[PDB]
From Swiss-Prot, chains A, B, C:
Protein name as annotated: Microtubule-associated protein tau
Subcellular location: Cytoplasm, Cytosol; Cell membrane; Cytoplasm, Cytoskeleton; Cell projection, Axon
The protein's assembly and partners: Interacts with MARK1, MARK2, MARK3 and MARK4. Interacts with PSMC2 through SQSTM1. Interacts with SQSTM1 when polyubiquitinated. Interacts with FKBP4. Binds to CSNK1D. Interacts with SGK1. Interacts with PIN1. Interacts with LRRK2. Interacts with LRP1, leading to endocytosis; this interaction is reduced in the presence of LRPAP1/RAP.
Its job: Promotes microtubule assembly and stability, and might be involved in the establishment and maintenance of neuronal polarity. The C-terminus binds axonal microtubules while the N-terminus binds neural plasma membrane components, suggesting that tau functions as a linker protein between both. Axonal polarity is predetermined by TAU/MAPT localization (in the neuronal cell) in the domain of the cell body defined by the centrosome. The short isoforms allow plasticity of the cytoskeleton whereas the longer isoforms may preferentially play a role in its stabilization.
Residues of the full protein shown: 623 to 695 of 758
Length: 73, 73, 73
């Protein structure tokens, strides 16, 4: 088996976002309330309560060229 | 086997973001009240309460070229 | 097995973010309250309470070329 493997990219990925802003994200709602009585757990518990893990993500340009060359035998 | 693996890129990933700002992220809500009585656990507990793990990510440009070349036998 | 492995990049990853700022992140809500009575644990507990692990991340440019080359037999 002979392989010549000679890809070429002039590949161009761009943004000209003129202005970006006035972005508001507010997961802070009203009362969370949890009340619990006489409840039994025989195995593991992973309780998450409140306003967890929320994201704001504002890349001024967010271009993402993913690229993969793979050979296998 | 013979391989001549010779890829080329002139590959260009860019952002001309003119002005980025006025971004607000507020997971700070109202109360988070937890009350608990006579409550039994036989195995591991991983309680998380409140306003945890939240993110604000604002890269002035966030361009992310990812490029994998892989050969395997 | 013969391999010639000679990739080329003139590859360019850029930002011209003109201005960046006025970013606010506020996980500090109202009262978290936890009250507990007659509560029993036979194995490990990993309680987290309040406003932990929060992130603000504002790189003036945050471009991230990742690039992997791998050969294996």
């Amino acid at each position: 088996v002979q392989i010549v493997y000679k890809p070429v990219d002039l590949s161009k990925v761009t943004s000209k976002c003129g202005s970006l802003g006035n972005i508001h994200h507010k997961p802070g709602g009203g009362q969370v309330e949890v009340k619990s009585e006489k409840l039994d757990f025989k195995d593991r518990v992973q309780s998450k309560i409140g306003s967890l893990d929320n994201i704001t993500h504002v890349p001024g340009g967010g271009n993402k060229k993913i690229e993969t060359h793979k050979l296998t035998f």
